[PDB]
Design a binder for this molecule. Structure first.
Ligand SMILES: [Cl-]
Ligand SMILES: [Cl-]
Length: 162
């Protein structure tokens, strides 16, 4: 297991524009196109991201290419963030994967707001961190996904994904 496989499991893979859990237009492997309600706005954002006139459909390769860019961007978002970087630096390989997952899902800013949970992870207080992370909209909206990430922080293993 690795970050790629992990997020592929959590986000699935769709070749046609779709609505995410929040109802926003997305494609591929969790690749958010726009928060705007217009399918045209989304189609426009899609052609610009792919570099071609897509008509709202892309290939597997193209999805994987957005995926790679998106993973990369998340890591880099983390390393640049004064609140995130230090937590990330303090964790083992597994748990880092879990941190990346949340950033990919909610953005650097969203994650950086879990101040209390962040501090708990930095202190290596796994069970406490897991309880705190659960008291959030995040967990109430996408509970199964949140549970898997949370167990990952709690155990330092990939069990939740096996
Ligand atoms: Cl892009
Ligand atoms: Cl879920």
């Amino acid at each position: 297991m690795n970050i790629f496989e992990m997020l592929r499991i959590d986000e699935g893979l769709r070749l046609k524009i779709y609505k995410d859990t929040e109802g926003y237009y997305t494609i591929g492997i969790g690749h958010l196109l726009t928060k705007s309600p217009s399918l045209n706005a989304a189609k426009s954002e899609l052609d610009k991201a792919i570099g071609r006139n897509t008509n709202g459909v892309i290939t597997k390769d193209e999805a994987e290419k957005l995926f790679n860019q998106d993973v990369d961007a998340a890591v880099r978002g983390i390393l640049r963030n004064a609140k995130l970087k230090p937590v990330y630096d303090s964790l083992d390989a597994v748990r880092r994967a879990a941190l990346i997952n949340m950033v990919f899902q909610m953005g650097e800013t969203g994650v950086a707001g879990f101040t209390n949970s962040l501090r708990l992870l930095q202190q290596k207080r796994w069970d406490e961190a897991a309880v705190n992370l659960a008291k959030s909209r995040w967990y109430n909206q996408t509970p199964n996904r949140a549970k898997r990430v949370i167990t990952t922080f709690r155990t330092g293993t990939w069990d939740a994904y096996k």
